[PDB]
Enzyme design. Structure first.
Site, PDB file in Angstrom:
ATOM      1  NE  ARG A  84      -1.980  -1.161   3.818  1.00 17.53           N
ATOM      2  CZ  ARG A  84      -3.169  -1.634   4.505  1.00 17.53           C
ATOM      3  NH1 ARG A  84      -4.333  -0.906   4.556  1.00 17.53           N
ATOM      4  NH2 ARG A  84      -3.230  -2.988   4.803  1.00 17.53           N
TER       5      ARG A  84
ATOM      6  CB  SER B 128       9.093  -6.329   4.455  1.00 19.18           C
ATOM      7  OG  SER B 128       8.073  -5.526   5.111  1.00 19.18           O
TER       8      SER B 128
ATOM      9  CG  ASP C  59       8.155  -5.569   8.252  1.00 20.11           C
ATOM     10  OD1 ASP C  59       9.545  -5.952   8.948  1.00 20.11           O
ATOM     11  OD2 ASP C  59       7.445  -6.350   7.784  1.00 20.11           O
TER      12      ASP C  59
HETATM   13  O1  LIG Z   1       2.852 -10.069   6.665  1.00 19.72           O
HETATM   14  P1  LIG Z   1       1.775  -9.426   7.163  1.00 19.72           P
HETATM   15  O2  LIG Z   1       0.992 -10.621   7.880  1.00 19.72           O
HETATM   16  O3  LIG Z   1       0.988  -8.681   6.413  1.00 19.72           O
HETATM   17  O4  LIG Z   1       2.242  -8.605   8.639  1.00 19.72           O
HETATM   18  C1  LIG Z   1       3.493  -7.979   8.399  1.00 19.72           C
HETATM   19  C2  LIG Z   1       3.013  -6.644   7.746  1.00 19.72           C
HETATM   20  O5  LIG Z   1       1.815  -5.874   8.591  1.00 19.72           O
HETATM   21  C3  LIG Z   1       1.609  -4.822   8.215  1.00 19.72           C
HETATM   22  O6  LIG Z   1       0.629  -4.206   8.929  1.00 19.72           O
HETATM   23  C4  LIG Z   1       2.671  -3.673   8.228  1.00 19.72           C
HETATM   24  O7  LIG Z   1       2.338  -2.356   7.800  1.00 19.72           O
HETATM   25  C5  LIG Z   1       3.808  -4.136   7.504  1.00 19.72           C
HETATM   26  O8  LIG Z   1       5.003  -3.322   7.579  1.00 19.72           O
HETATM   27  C6  LIG Z   1       4.241  -5.557   7.884  1.00 19.72           C
HETATM   28  O9  LIG Z   1       5.296  -5.971   7.072  1.00 19.72           O
HETATM   29  O1  LIG Z   2       8.050  -8.867   7.042  1.00 22.56           O
HETATM   30  C1  LIG Z   2       8.502  -9.475   8.234  1.00 22.56           C
HETATM   31  C2  LIG Z   2       9.891  -9.895   8.005  1.00 22.56           C
HETATM   32  O2  LIG Z   2       9.952 -10.894   7.207  1.00 22.56           O
HETATM   33  C3  LIG Z   2      11.412 -11.617   7.092  1.00 22.56           C
HETATM   34  O3  LIG Z   2      11.391 -12.716   6.525  1.00 22.56           O
HETATM   35  C4  LIG Z   2      12.264 -10.192   6.345  1.00 22.56           C
HETATM   36  O4  LIG Z   2      13.476 -10.584   5.989  1.00 22.56           O
HETATM   37  C5  LIG Z   2      12.153  -9.091   7.102  1.00 22.56           C
HETATM   38  O5  LIG Z   2      12.768  -8.050   6.641  1.00 22.56           O
HETATM   39  C6  LIG Z   2      10.676  -8.677   7.684  1.00 22.56           C
HETATM   40  O6  LIG Z   2      10.837  -7.688   8.748  1.00 22.56           O
END
Ligand SMILES: O=P(O)(O)OC[C@H]1O[C@@H](O)[C@H](O)[C@@H](O)[C@@H]1O
Ligand SMILES: OC[C@H]1O[C@@H](O)[C@H](O)[C@@H](O)[C@@H]1O
Ligand SMILES: O=P(O)(O)OC[C@H]1O[C@@H](O)[C@H](O)[C@@H](O)[C@@H]1O
Ligand SMILES: O=P(O)(O)OC[C@H]1O[C@@H](O)[C@H](O)[C@@H](O)[C@@H]1O
Ligand SMILES: O=P(O)(O)OC[C@H]1O[C@@H](O)[C@H](O)[C@@H](O)[C@@H]1O
Ligand SMILES: OC[C@H]1O[C@@H](O)[C@H](O)[C@@H](O)[C@@H]1O
Ligand SMILES: OC[C@H]1O[C@@H](O)[C@H](O)[C@@H](O)[C@@H]1O
Ligand SMILES: OC[C@H]1O[C@@H](O)[C@H](O)[C@@H](O)[C@@H]1O
Ligand code: NA
Ligand code: NA
Ligand code: NA
Ligand code: NA
Lengths: 899, 899
Positions: free
Chosen positions: B524, B588, B642
């Site tokens: 997003r 991430s 993240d």
């Molecule tokens: O991988 P998921 O389940 O969407 O959760 C992690 C993500 O959660 C989101 O809410 C965050 O904004 C991201 O930064 C994060 O990487």
């Molecule tokens: O998104 C959650 C996490 O996933 C990990 O496998 C990534 O290497 C990280 O950079 C991230 O913080």
């Protein structure tokens, strides 16, 4: 005409046929059943939440209430007053408070501080802070409710996303918000959905209104469902209002064939992506933006303004539902279209205005049609529930879209009436919003809360704190000292009577003994054979003998003539008539003893009052009846209290056992005391078991402190008024009577049984140990409880049953705690006697209340652990009765007699 | 005819008209229904106990078995051999062990010691002590069972009364007695009632057997009931044998209009007063004594032997049911009655003999009749369950009374068949006893026990002890060190990358920011406004953008062109296209940073594999994609992970939030480290946020110790084989795959889905986070679990559902603990760093698995608390994504730049 036939084809997917609507509806009828089923609910997207409103206002409502209304277009605070007795027709004033985006999106704190502040202000102005006004809360998001004054936010919707609210109780949240202020006191008594508030408002004027509909910022409907369908609420009694929360209809993909690329894009830009997908195709928070999305698509494809596209046309929200409404008006429809579009920057042609206006039609015609699909579902549920060939009901309605749009109502009704032709529905537009309906709920809720408050008030007197229990323990110990000491023994209420049993079984007991067990629920005669040595064995037999009403309160001669008569019979039965056998006599009433084989009845207790017994030696009375019959001879060696008999019975296998506890018809304890402490028996060497006779605790008034109005009634109407007060708060012969009295009081108060005191309820002894034990059983469905009560003769409803059960638990809980405080004092004195820091001791227990009750022993043990933390007490259940122990005691009696 | 005329009139109440019998039958019918209902069961006297025997033998049974038989007229131990594949039908050898009174009436300890001793003597003589012979246990007393190898004695009946057994699991009690001997091993694999044993024995020979009936010392019957009618056992598939325990029929006063004074008197002398009242009118243990009591009553009233009475006649047990049989023999009845009565001391006259005989007749006839009524209810029950007009079934039978009485069988059969018209009934008398049936049960139980053993063995590898978890913590601590010290950094798996974020928000951050959220489940673009100063607010918007599979694994150029494409659309959406806004990039994936605005993609993780991205600076890639459009320009100020973003988002509110955690698609963590320990960045002043990239923990083999066969498969089939080991045991992208692989294994072994590895099961992804969270949802119904699986394509039963839920739970639990140990390492390092004895810090948390799972967070928190007791850790859930924290980092970026 291509200007329209063309749009029609383009937005083809957003024009649903009666054929399609029928399927939608059918699918919602399913989603409803799934949402009501205890099994399917956890998975259902349509929560069918129970709201705890049992019916629309009847007119008996009266009083003065404050109502809150959050979650809608605006944060509204009202004030409703009604009193038909004083002939005061419904009156109400209302105000609106500003609520900036920042608060609606910040933390729950900022928010609920804001609401509490606007309430503080609203009351500051009318100067009503000092008045105990009951608050009703209109909160319009799905909520988890187990009681009308509890609202756990399941998930934000519409325009709200506030941190740390979902999963919390907005009632406690609002409360805390206020508290922090200290500005006012506020009694939040109810929380309803605006759907529910709306159904109540219209129901007030139309006794046929069975549905609550809202089509504004958001969409959602509530309706009157049969309790025999709300699996998630114990009951089958009448009906209750179900908040369907149909906005979330299809959040599980069930409507992917209906949703269009536009719905998916508005979704991806929404506050709650993935959720409230049905609502996102309907309510007025989305309609405007939906149109703007379609117009951006067309523009990008040249279908409008040539294909001129301004930055304002691409900006989120530049296109309101206001504009949708304004464009749809009959006279200024196109005039406004032109204006709205000109402001957008595009170069609106007269053709463009006509296309745009048609788009608005398609988008709004759809919303209205969808609601017709689902509402049609509800009505189908009603017509079914009843069984009538046709349906005639009123549907309350509200919300900006339905109220302000100039084509929506008209269109919606028509499509609805068409979908369900077998219905004569009347739509009534709420004019007060939810205020009137809300307050009509707050009124009943307050009414109910007042009774409850009173119930709790009365029951609270049965609650004992850690400290109060420590006091009871302390008073018990003081009374023990008084009973043991020669100078104070005569005035001591806790007699601490010597049993002349100096030690627990030493494993040399041998022989054949007879035994009596008199004083408990069952009088019986026993034969006990004990064999010591390598292979030690016990062999017992017994026969219960009834003791007639008469004989039990008759002359002493009769009673013992009967007893002996029973002995005779048993000797025949065992085939042992002839030999002169030794006899242990378990007599369970306080006796003054000079030796093991002499006991002078001090006073009758429990249910026994035989004339010419008190003052006599019961062993003499027995020997007399034996000589009188003259059939056979016996050598009565001992008289024992059931406490001691019990301790010895358990001591046989458990050498750590030195305490005897009885919790049956009566309650009493015994324990091994040091002879140096038993100032009433000469000699300070060794030990002796002391029959405490602790039931008389409180007879000198030392417990008036915690005895209640109902305890005094039971005592006052008993066979022995003024005596055995402690026992009367603990044992099975009495607990029921306490419960009974409470229920009588509650019935006169109108809390129970429609306020009618049954002839049964006036029967003493109605709540036996057995009944109380059954009523308090765990996970026991209300239906079973109510069944038991009707079995006793008590005509009761689910609510009655709940109240009764609560009452029984409060009484039995207190019994276990008081018993625990006494035992705690006892074991602690033993610990000190041995000069230990920690003590492991085991108690031998017996009694019908103790064996049968599902919580007594548990709560009793807990209490002892907490009050005497320096002792580790083990409670051992006696399964054989007192006979074993009595025999064991008779064995020693014989050796010392034949000594 | 005069003699019999008067006796019939004297014992009128013991002769039962079919009208009465049909009455009783209807009653038992209702009683069965009550015992089976979850609502009435707790108050029903007929317990309808589940037996966990699904069906009678199907011929597949085979093996060498031992069978115990206790509770009947004799204690028997048998050996059953069943070999169909070897012409060996069914062979058995049994041995009776004398069981004296003392043992049956003493302590549970003696009883089971005695049993364990006999089982020993038995195995000794057969020298079978060394074989793995499975043991089945016939224990003819009512027991509560949740599984076939558990048996909690509810209450003693018949001639048994051993202390310390009621409420206990006799299976444990036995193993306990066995282990206390040291002579051998015993695999008690099943416990059954004798009615069940009898049913299975007859079922072996007659496939139509649906009832097992006992009419010996005690009386009882079991039958095949439909699982849908058995409330107390979740499941609607098939049938299960139900032990009615019909001896307790009437114990609630249900049969008082049937019970006579003789029944009441025999009761008052019984070993179990007030219980088994129906049984006490029927079985052999009582019929004789019942007769004696009538002879005594009659003698006293002159109606017999001139009215003479002997001590013998008045003795308990002098008239055995055995004598009752003899006296009812066609040829010798009266002759036998002569001998019997002459031994009793009376002066038997030929009339007396006839009188007596007719008494026996009435008594035994009533017994038979009563049993006919209750069996009839069962037969009628069986029929309705089929829904057919007629019924054909076979009733297995055993018991001394039924086997040896000269008239009973005939009379019983007669009355029964008359009571149930539309039914053909075969009465097969078990000649071998229940031993053969018991063995048949044992065979299936063992077969099943073996499956459980193997399943539990597999699953145990996922169990981690507190000690193991401490190790994981310790190993994690080491890895952190290696990652920080430049001496070992290059070789370290846990990289401990520097984020170049030095301090949590100081409260001054101000301005407008753009943000990107790439790496989680949703990509997003966000707009964030942060107002500082006296009034502090944060307003943010965002839109989700789908990244098509292809693009996600296309080329870096396409990926970042797509990214920038969306950035452009969002700028339109927000209406802010024009100005050069500062942007925060949440990326991430592990990045090597030399500054806040420089990040080299070290490697792809999770589902991403765009080409020519690795080794590049992702900011460069973005700035380039932006240039390649020239539509607009922006100012990329920062690239953030993240974890770092989430920590800042949460530290904005909480000043002790010095740690970040993500448990979503992937798992990772960050924390505020001290520059001195950050050897990889020049300086030792102040602090810096370290993105641990802890997923790669274990990539050097340091967890090979706990990783399982299933972990290896999931890793070996992933996009990044060998990498992110730790993460693959924790996050939502992987856990489902661990489960799927376990399920496939179990399916081949034949434990699940009939050994059918469906195409659905072969599909990876099947067990998403969402689904995995539903399955484990607390107090969810089995059908609900089965429903969801069916919904997946997995056609599964209730047992299948049980196993899948267990599996899911083992995997999710391990994940939470493993995660917990990681955090415990992190918080405790900070504690020590700051030389504190206790540390209070809070962790910002985010991720779908963490949000949606019903147990993960709870278990995780609990583990942290347990492994790092010197730490108090708080977990603040981030409700609005990493965006906020990212903008907060941007702020301090633009600032430190100009400043
Ligand atoms: O991988 P998921 O389940 O969407 O959760 C992690 C993500 O959660 C989101 O809410 C965050 O904004 C991201 O930064 C994060 O990487
Ligand atoms: O998104 C959650 C996490 O996933 C990990 O496998 C990534 O290497 C990280 O950079 C991230 O913080
Ligand atoms: O959100 P809208 O368009 O104002 O409509 C719904 C609201 O309508 C109001 O009239 C009611 O008082 C509220 O309870 C309700 O939430
Ligand atoms: O009063 P209850 O419930 O019958 O219990 C007390 C009786 O319990 C019996 O088990 C004991 O053998 C009696 O000695 C004792 O009096
Ligand atoms: O009570 P009785 O006469 O021993 O009859 C019942 C017994 O019958 C036997 O044949 C069975 O093997 C036992 O399992 C059962 O308990
Ligand atoms: O305000 C109307 C409706 O809005 C919906 O989105 C909410 O979920 C409901 O609680 C409410 O009835
Ligand atoms: O039956 C239990 C107890 O009841 C009390 O009321 C009696 O006075 C005691 O003697 C007896 O131990
Ligand atoms: O063995 C005959 C029957 O006796 C009954 O009293 C027992 O409770 C049953 O378990 C048993 O089947
Ligand atoms: Na209900
Ligand atoms: Na003394
Ligand atoms: Na079932
Ligand atoms: Na450094």
């Amino acid at each position: 005409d291509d200007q329209v036939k063309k749009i029609d084809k383009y937005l083809y997917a957003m024009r649903l046929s009666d054929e399609t609507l029928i399927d939608i509806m059918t699918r919602f009828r399913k989603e409803m059943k799934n949402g009501l089923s205890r099994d399917f609910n956890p998975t259902a997207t349509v929560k069918m939440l129970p709201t705890f409103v049992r019916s629309i206002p009847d007119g008996s409502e009266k009083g003065d209430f404050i109502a809150l209304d959050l979650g809608g277009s605006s944060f509204r605070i009202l004030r409703v007053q009604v009193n038909h007795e004083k002939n005061q027709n419904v009156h109400m004033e209302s105000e609106v408070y500003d609520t900036p985006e920042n608060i609606v999106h910040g933390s729950g704190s900022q928010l609920f501080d804001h609401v509490a502040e606007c309430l503080g202000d609203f009351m500051e102005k009318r100067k009503i802070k000092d008045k105990k006004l009951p608050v009703g809360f209109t909160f319009s998001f799905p909520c988890q409710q187990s009681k009308i004054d509890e609202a756990i936010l399941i998930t934000w919707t519409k325009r709200f996303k506030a941190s740390g609210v979902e999963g919390a109780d907005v009632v406690k949240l609002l409360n805390k918000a206020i508290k922090k202020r200290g500005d006012y006191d506020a009694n939040i008594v109810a929380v309803v959905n605006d759907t529910v508030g709306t159904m109540m408002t219209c129901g007030y004027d139309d006794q046929h209104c069975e549905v609550g509909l809202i089509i504004g910022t958001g969409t959602n409907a509530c309706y009157m469902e049969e309790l025999r369908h709300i699996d998630l609420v114990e009951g089958d009694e009448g009906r209750m209002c179900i908040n369907t929360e149909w906005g979330a209809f299809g959040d599980d993909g069930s409507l992917e064939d209906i949703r269009t690329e536009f719905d998916r894009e508005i979704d991806r830009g929404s506050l709650n992506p993935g959720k409230q997908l049905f609502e996102k195709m309907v309510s007025g928070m989305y309609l405007g933006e939906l149109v703007r999305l379609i117009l951006v698509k067309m523009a990008k494809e040249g279908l409008l303004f040539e294909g001129r596209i301004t930055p304002e046309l691409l900006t989120r929200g530049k296109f309101n539902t206001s504009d949708v409404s304004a464009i749809e008006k009959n006279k200024e429809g196109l005039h406004n279209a032109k204006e709205i579009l000109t402001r957008l920057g595009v170069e609106p042609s007269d053709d463009d205005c006509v296309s745009v206006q048609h788009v608005c039609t398609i988008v709004s015609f759809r919303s209205a049609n969808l609601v017709a699909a689902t509402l049609g579902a509800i009505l189908n549920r009603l017509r079914d529930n009843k069984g009538t060939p046709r349906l005639r009901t009123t549907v309350g309605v509200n919300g900006s879209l339905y109220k302000t749009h100039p084509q929506y109502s008209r269109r919606f009704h028509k499509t609805l009436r068409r979908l369900v032709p077998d219905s004569d529905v009347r739509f009534l537009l709420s004019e007060s919003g939810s205020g009137k309906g809300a307050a009509m709920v707050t009124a009943v809720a307050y009414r109910l809360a007042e009774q409850h408050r009173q119930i709790e008030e009365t029951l609270a007197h049965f609650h004992l704190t850690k400290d109060m229990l420590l006091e009871v323990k302390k008073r018990m110990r003081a009374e023990m000292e008084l009973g043991l000491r020669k100078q104070t023994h005569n005035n001591a209420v806790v007699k601490m009577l010597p049993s002349f049993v100096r030690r627990t079984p030493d494993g040399t007991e041998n022989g054949d003994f007879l035994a009596l067990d008199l004083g408990g629920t069952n009088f019986r005669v026993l034969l006990v054979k004990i064999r010591s040595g390598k292979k030690r064995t016990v062999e017992m037999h017994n026969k219960i003998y009834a003791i007639p009403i008469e004989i039990m309160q008759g002359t002493g001669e009769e009673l013992f003539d009967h007893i002996v008569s029973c002995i005779s019979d048993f000797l025949d039965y065992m085939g042992i008539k002839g030999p002169r056998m030794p006899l242990g006599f378990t007599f369970s009433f306080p006796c003054q003893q000079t030796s093991l084989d002499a006991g002078i009845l001090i006073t009758w207790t429990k249910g026994f009052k035989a004339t010419d017994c008190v003052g006599h030696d019961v062993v003499t009375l027995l020997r007399d009846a034996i000589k009188r019959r003259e059939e056979f001879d016996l050598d009565v060696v001992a008289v024992v209290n059931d406490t001691v008999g019990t301790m010895m019975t358990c001591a046989y296998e458990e050498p750590t056992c030195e305490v005897g506890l009885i919790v049956g018809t009566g309650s009493n304890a015994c324990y091994m005391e040091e002879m140096k402490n038993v100032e009433m028996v000469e000699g300070d060497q060794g030990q002796m078991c002391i029959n405490m006779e602790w039931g008389a605790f409180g007879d000198n008034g030392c417990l008036d402190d915690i005895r209640t109005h109902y305890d005094r009634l039971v005592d006052e109407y008993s066979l022995n008024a003024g005596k055995q007060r402690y026992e009367k708060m603990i044992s099975g012969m009495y607990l029921g009577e306490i419960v009974r009295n409470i229920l009588i009081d509650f019935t006169k108060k109108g809390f129970l049984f429609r306020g009618q005191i049954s002839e049964t309820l006036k029967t003493r002894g109605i709540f036996e140990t057995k009944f109380l034990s059954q009523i308090e059983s765990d996970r026991l469905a209300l239906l079973q409880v109510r069944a038991i009560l009707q079995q006793l003769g008590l005509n009761s409803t689910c609510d009655d049953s709940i109240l009764v059960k609560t009452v029984c638990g409060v009484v039995s809980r207190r019994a276990a705690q008081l018993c625990g405080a006494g035992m705690a004092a006892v074991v602690d004195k033993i610990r000190e006697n041995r000069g230990l820091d920690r003590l492991n001791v085991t108690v031998g227990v017996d009694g019908t209340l103790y064996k049968l009750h599902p919580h007594f022993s548990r709560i009793m043990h807990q209490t002892v652990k907490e009050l005497s933390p320096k002792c580790n007490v083990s409670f051992l259940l006696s399964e054989d009765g007192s006979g074993k122990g009595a025999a064991l005691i008779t064995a020693v009696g014989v050796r010392l007699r034949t000594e």
